[PDB]
Amino acid sequence: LGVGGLDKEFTKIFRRAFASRIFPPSVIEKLGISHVKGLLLYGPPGTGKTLIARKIGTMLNAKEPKIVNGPEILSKYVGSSEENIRNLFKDAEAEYRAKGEESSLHIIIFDELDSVFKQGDNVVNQLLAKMDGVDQLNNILVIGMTNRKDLIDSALLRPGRFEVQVEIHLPDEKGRLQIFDIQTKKMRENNMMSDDVNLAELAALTKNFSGAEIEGLVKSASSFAINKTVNNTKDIAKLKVTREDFLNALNDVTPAFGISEEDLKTCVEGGMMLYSERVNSILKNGARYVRQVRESDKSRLVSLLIHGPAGSGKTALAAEIALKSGFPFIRLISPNELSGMSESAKIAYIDNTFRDAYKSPLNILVIDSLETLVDWVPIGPRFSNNILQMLKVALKRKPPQDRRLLIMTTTSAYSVLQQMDILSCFDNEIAVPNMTNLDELNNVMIESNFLDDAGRVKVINELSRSCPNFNVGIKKTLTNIETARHDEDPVNELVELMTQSA
Amino acid sequence: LGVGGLDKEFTKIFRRAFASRIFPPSVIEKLGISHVKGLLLYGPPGTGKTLIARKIGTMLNAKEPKIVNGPEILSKYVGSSEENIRNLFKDAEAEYRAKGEESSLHIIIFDELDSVFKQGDNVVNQLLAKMDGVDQLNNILVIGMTNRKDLIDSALLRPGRFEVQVEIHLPDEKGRLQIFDIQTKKMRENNMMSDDVNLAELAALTKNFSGAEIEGLVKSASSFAINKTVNNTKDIAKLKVTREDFLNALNDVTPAFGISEEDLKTCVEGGMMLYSERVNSILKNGARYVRQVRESDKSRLVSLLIHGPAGSGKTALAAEIALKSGFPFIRLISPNELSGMSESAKIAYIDNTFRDAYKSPLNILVIDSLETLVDWVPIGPRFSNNILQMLKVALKRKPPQDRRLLIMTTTSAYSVLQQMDILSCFDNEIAVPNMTNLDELNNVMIESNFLDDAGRVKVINELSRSCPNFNVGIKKTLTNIETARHDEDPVNELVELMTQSA
């Protein structure tokens, strides 16, 4: 037919809404049943809802559907907006006067149905009165479509109105291998496709692409072969695309529900040097929870707290554990995203982020500096109570239907979180200490190629009686080393910075 | 073609948006790909985004591009505003009905697209309908332009809408040489340009000029040579522009993204004298960080705190370090800039200043009198929490894309910042102490010729017995020395003032 990967939920639509339309009225009169008049489809954008609503009508040989946009009718002035509602059905009315129950099936698509409620009452009255009032047309069938099911009021969902509802899902790996077979077909039968490409590879790499994004990949890959030979010449009738084109294109289309990789990675890491055994222990703990979530049925939600002094290195460890996990979906929430929003906008940004994490089979979330998102200042104290009560719920709600996620949160002010008592949310606590031994500083000096070994010995010797007991974080230690590299005499400056920091 | 310095952007634009229009229709119908309908260009103003749109379309010999300006739609009356969106496409429809699919390309430029969202839903919806709806045209391509990309709703950026996005940067030194080649062409071939000029020099002095400001320079340098002949004369054919005429024009034109020279030099500095050995060490240690930021790869953000008593000389040291750096971009934020603004306007002025600093290769910021920007007063205490949380984030965010900057900030209220808990933001702290020795008072008098030295002994001989332990700042000392000079008995006046001031 033309739609891939929906073979299950395709069946249910036909069974309830259309199979009754195939039989002639005389056997329907024998049963005394009455045709359903509304259907509601919901799911994430770009998944092919309209494609279903169009392709089904071809099997009935029905009229090509009318299509309407909510925001248009709502943003039009009330006058033509009002009169446009009544103008719609005249065709479905007209053939009913001419032919009645022999009349051909009519269909109307009403897009963005939630836009009416997210603030059309006349439209809702008129739209119902034509299908459920006394002026009941039997010709019509209205398809509603929305991204959010929770905004539509139950007054529309009682029987006779929108009585059947279906959910559309992102395609799994068996499905993307079908969607490639649909999109590429014309390139294959004309032999414009090389034979080194193999679609069983491309279905595995496109780990989370939706249906609409796979076209962008095919179209983008094809655009290299054209540009390779332009600049009105021969070989126009001899063009081929190559597996090289199908691997360059993966850099020009970036998926939604993907990995934010210019965050983390190049931004959050300036090193990772295993100066002490305690670092190896923490990275082994972090990697164990990542596999427990992958390989267990019994725990779909885990959340961890990472805490310690300021500048001790918490955020780089939370990112390093994530990039090695390989999960399809990763995002973070940090103060850099929320700057300049009003409080009423901040709560909507947090809420929308969690609504996305319930749509992929595996997920990670990172929350950076929880004490800063709440606006804590100790002089009052002053803080936002509305934002605190949002997070306190979101950390306990479990995702639906065997989806699962791992949450990691970091803080510098454990004494304050204990005073708000929210510590009943977390399943475990990981503590990060500062540096405290001169042997650890020797490892840092070696690993960063400070200077030749004759110099490093004197620096350790000098501190060994000037300040044997110092206590300083790794973030500051790597700064003092880097400024002394540029002075006249590093050995006599680095000691003076470290004793000031001690 | 006549556009310079934008090599890499040109390939990326041509490959995706236009190459598909060059091949014959029969081969595109063979592949089955579909033409891209929208392209988004963003960057700083005056950098040739509109220029590119005209000069690309001439290679296709397409029709002259229509132009419409966002505020010219929005500020009209709604009725004629609404009608104009329907009017704009009338030509593209009419040719399509006459030619069908073989119609020539049409192109439309939509300027200040970010004006529509910062409040347009009708005009947004109608614009989408012509490119994404049932009535979608194949003849059009729509070019969008913005400066503040983050104001675009991501609903515009999904496949099929504004699918491709490109950033235009300020030119580097390899590029500014090409712009002078283009702009001077007519002057050189008519021989109206002297042989004493050297375009490879002027490209180096125009250290941060944008393309639109080099037109202003070349025009202004020509106006001197014209005016030199008027008050209109015979022998006009003798004209030449000369190297000196560019050196005079380079004072009449001043760029954005340049030094705020007169607000640093004339206001903040009023004599710098090396009265004591502590002052040599602060300037030496301050000049080290300026070459760390210039030369090191691994550190791209640095922030310093300068703190100490009132009137000690803190603001004059911050400006003296800046004016010797030679960095291209320098600015300061001080209470004089924000006086009389509303709290909702103060936050907007601070935010916009940091987003300019992220566009140049090297930058400095001075943030003066930190406890005054917050309005802190101890009787309540009262202060603004919304401004404090604006600064606490902005001091930690690293600049994008291998750019770098140095931040310096000054305070008198170290005992208060220790309560607001913001001292984790700063990498090093510099202390500026008061005067305490009569050798320091002697050095200040010698530098400023208070009076002949046979008198100058007596001031110290009396203070040495009247009150040796005087403790005063340099700001008050220079004020006392200047008011005694105009008296009848300078010796007693200065001794009295310093004894009282202590």
Ligand SMILES: Nc1ncnc2c1ncn2[C@@H]1O[C@H](COP(=O)(O)OP(=O)(O)OP(=O)(O)O)[C@@H](O)[C@H]1O
């Ligand atoms: N083994 C390590 N553990 C932690 N950090 C390391 C290690 N090796 C190098 N680093 C570096 O130390 C710095 C730690 O910075 P980071 O921002 O994570 O500190 P932080 O404690 O989170 O700061 P804040 O408390 O202000 O959030 C980074 O530049 C990181 O590359």
Ligand SMILES: Nc1ncnc2c1ncn2[C@@H]1O[C@H](COP(=O)(O)OP(=O)(O)OP(=O)(O)O)[C@@H](O)[C@H]1O
């Ligand atoms: N070595 C020096 N260091 C600092 N200032 C000096 C020095 N020599 C002369 N001056 C002069 O002393 C004055 C110091 O004034 P300035 O406004 O910098 O004080 P301040 O510490 O900023 O005062 P406030 O604490 O109110 O900001 C300036 O006019 C400056 O030119």
Ligand SMILES: Nc1ncnc2c1ncn2[C@@H]1O[C@H](COP(=O)(O)OP(=O)(O)O)[C@@H](O)[C@H]1O
């Ligand atoms: N499962 C699928 N199989 C084939 N094509 C698909 C599929 N999903 C999306 N598409 C393609 O993307 C478009 C259909 O999705 P569309 O209806 O535009 O998204 P939405 O449902 O958000 O309106 C068509 O161009 C269609 O060919």
Ligand SMILES: Nc1ncnc2c1ncn2[C@@H]1O[C@H](COP(=O)(O)OP(=O)(O)O)[C@@H](O)[C@H]1O
């Ligand atoms: N890269 C460039 N090469 C040559 N001239 C340029 C360039 N960029 C800008 N100019 C000059 O600046 C003038 C105005 O630029 P404009 O296209 O209006 O910039 P924008 O549209 O981004 O404001 C142009 O007419 C042109 O002569």
Ligand SMILES: [Mg+2]
């Ligand atoms: Mg942190």
Ligand SMILES: [Mg+2]
């Ligand atoms: Mg000052």
